[PDB]
UniProtKB/Swiss-Prot annotation:
GO terms for biological process: cell wall macromolecule catabolic process; defense response to bacterium; defense response to Gram-negative bacterium; defense response to Gram-positive bacterium; killing of cells of another organism. This is Lysozyme C. Its EC number is 3.2.1.17. The gene is LYZ. Belongs to the glycosyl hydrolase 22 family. The lineage of its organism: Eukaryota, Metazoa, Chordata, Craniata, Vertebrata. It comes from Gallus gallus (Chicken).
C-alpha cells in the first residue's frame, strides 16, 4: 500500500505515535516519507547483508527475522515480512520499541538528515486529525 500523507498521519495517530516519546506526529510522517515514500512494501538491502523493511525501513540486523541475516537479533519478535503489510500496526509497534531504546528517532537516518530541525508540522498540515 502507498499511503497518502494525511491518510498515514491519521493511521499513525490512531496507533499512538503522536507525541510518542516526545516526537510530534509530523516527525513520524516525515520519516516515513523519506524512508519509504509512504510505501509499505519498500525493501532495501544494506552492505552488511541486513535488509530494511516497510514504511519505516526497520532493519533485520536488530529488529525482525528474515532468515537471511546471520547473527542478527529479532527484538520486535516478528518476521520482517509482517512489516510490509498494508496494516501498519506491526511497523508502529516495532517503531515504538526502537524509538525507546535510547537514541530516539536518530535510529532513522532519513529522519536525522531530512526531518530533524525542519518544520515537521508541515507534514500534517491540511489533514483532518
Amino acid at each position: 500500500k502507498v499511503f497518502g500523507r494525511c491518510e498515514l498521519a491519521a493511521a499513525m495517530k490512531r496507533h499512538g505515535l503522536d507525541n510518542y516519546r516526545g516526537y510530534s506526529l509530523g516527525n513520524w510522517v516525515c520519516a516515513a516519507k523519506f524512508e519509504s515514500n509512504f510505501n509499505t512494501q519498500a525493501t532495501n538491502r544494506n552492505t552488511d547483508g541486513s535488509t530494511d523493511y516497510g514504511i519505516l525501513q526497520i532493519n533485520s540486523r536488530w529488529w525482525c527475522n528474515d532468515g537471511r541475516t546471520p547473527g542478527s537479533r529479532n527484538l520486535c519478535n516478528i518476521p520482517c515480512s509482517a512489516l510490509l503489510s498494508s496494516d501498519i500496526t506491526a511497523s508502529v509497534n516495532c517503531a515504538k520499541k526502537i524509538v525507546s531504546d535510547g537514541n530516539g528517532m536518530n535510529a532513522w537516518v532519513a529522519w536525522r538528515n531530512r526531518c530533524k530541525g525542519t518544520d515537521v508540522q508541515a507534514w500534517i498540515r491540511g489533514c483532518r486529525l
